[PDB]
Swiss-Prot record, chain A:
Superkingdom field: Bacteria
Similarity annotation: Belongs to the bacterial secretin family. PilQ subfamily.
Function: Essential for the formation of pili. Involved in the biogenesis of type 4 fimbriae probably by serving as a 'porthole' allowing passage of the fimbrae through the outer membrane.
Residues of the full protein shown: 481 to 712 of 714
Protein known as: Fimbrial assembly protein PilQ
Subcellular compartments: Cell outer membrane
UniProtKB/Swiss-Prot annotation, chain B:
Highest taxon, organism lineage: Bacteria
Residues of the full protein shown: 578 to 712 of 714
Family stated for the protein in its record: Belongs to the bacterial secretin family. PilQ subfamily.
Subcellular locations according to the entry: Cell outer membrane
Function: Essential for the formation of pili. Involved in the biogenesis of type 4 fimbriae probably by serving as a 'porthole' allowing passage of the fimbrae through the outer membrane.
Protein name: Fimbrial assembly protein PilQ
Transmembrane regions listed in the UniProt entry: none
Provenance organism: Pseudomonas aeruginosa (strain ATCC 15692 / DSM 22644 / CIP 104116 / JCM 14847 / LMG 12228 / 1C / PRS 101 / PAO1)
Length: 232, 135, 97
């Protein structure tokens, strides 16, 4: 049997027998089969999955050999930039998203509809220094609404958030924070003897390799509105 | 409109919490002589949640900026803005057939989605003192 | 019966009897069987698991000997590096999840 896309012809050869072919084997040397309707239907449905290679013999011997391979590539890029205008040494926020509620409707004295927004958000408290720089305490959260919440189960919302206070000039962009997640997964499933042989092992070693690498970085640039406020 | 959550709670707690998904402005303007205002304004655009319409667990959608800024009367500014650029590519491909150029389009399953939504809020305050002096 | 991938042909030989073969054994010296449809189906489905070696005799004696072996190798490497910019003698956090 295969493993990446598991297949074993013999079980579905019993299903083929359910179709009705005549199979006789009295000893390991002696065997013969006739009236086989199993291959075209059993393999056709069985082998429907994306990558498949089918080889079938029935008259001399019934040998069905299928290679099932799937290769999937997905690249997702998200670029979101929120701009907030804030007074010096004051807090301001930008929020775009949605607040999932949890109604802990509690009969005895506790009604806590806790509700938290999976949103792109900036909470900024900038302090301006004379040379067009700011030391700002900013909490930057990118939270996306949980699938299970959409599923109405136990909702784990997904949060990517950095909270920190830093100093930067107005005409300056910085990396507030960044994370690179490099996932390297290899799984190979192999019958020992056939796995040994080089050509046979590709035919007889079931390899699943997955590489997922997601990197997230947040930049920031503050453009002083004093340049306009002095005009104001 | 204000979706309610009746936390009708038998033992002492009746909290019909209710919150309006609405377009709203909460303004506290302070006027300076030269026809300018420093105003603390909370500007919320909240749309009624589908799940609330679905009578499930209702996540209302909120786009809200709260800040205090100074602007002149004849001036329009960007209180806040956000651009969301989503670039998603998914290609599904059988290796051997995917290799071949003509065959790969026939044998590489490509889903590409680009969603870009940008939201910006402007503002202009027209002093009614121009009329209040007449008043 | 095996244990890594448990197999015992005799139980499924009773299942084979359910298929309908003629088996007669009056003493330990004397036995004979005919009309056996059990091997091809019972073993084919039974032995479907990955590693299997099947040897079957029925006419003189019914002896089915199967070796079932699985060898699995999985290597997973995860490298994640988060960078946080923090002021001196202050707390800052990076969270992704």
């Amino acid at each position: 049997s295969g493993y990446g896309k598991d297949g074993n012809i013999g079980i579905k050869d019993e299903d083929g027998m359910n179709c009705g072919p005549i199979a006789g084997s009295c000893t390991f040397p002696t065997t013969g089969t006739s009236k086989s309707p199993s291959p075209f239907v059993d393999l056709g449905a069985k082998d429907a999955t994306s990558g498949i290679g089918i080889g079938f013999i029935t008259d001399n011997i019934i040998l069905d050999l299928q290679l099932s391979a799937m290769e999937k590539t997905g690249n997702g890029e998200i670029v979101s930039q929120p701009k907030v205008v804030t007074s010096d040494k004051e807090t301001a926020k930008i929020l775009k998203g949605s607040e999932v509620p949890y109604q802990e409707a509690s009969s005895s004295g506790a009604t806590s509809t806790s509700f938290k927004e999976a949103a792109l958000s900036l909470e900024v408290t900038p302090q301006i220094t004379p040379d067009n720089r700011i030391i700002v305490e900013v909490k930057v959260t990118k939270d996306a609404p949980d699938y299970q919440n959409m599923l109405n189960g136990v909702p784990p919302i997904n949060k990517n958030e950095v909270n920190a206070k830093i100093l930067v000039n107005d005409g300056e962009t910085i990396v507030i924070g960044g994370v690179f997640s490099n996932e390297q997964s290899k799984s190979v499933e192999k019958v020992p003897f056939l796995g040994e042989l080089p050509y046979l092992g590709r035919l007889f070693r079931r390899d699943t390799v997955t590489d997922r690498k997601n990197e997230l970085l947040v930049f920031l640039t503050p453009r002083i509105m004093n340049n306009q406020a002095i005009a104001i």
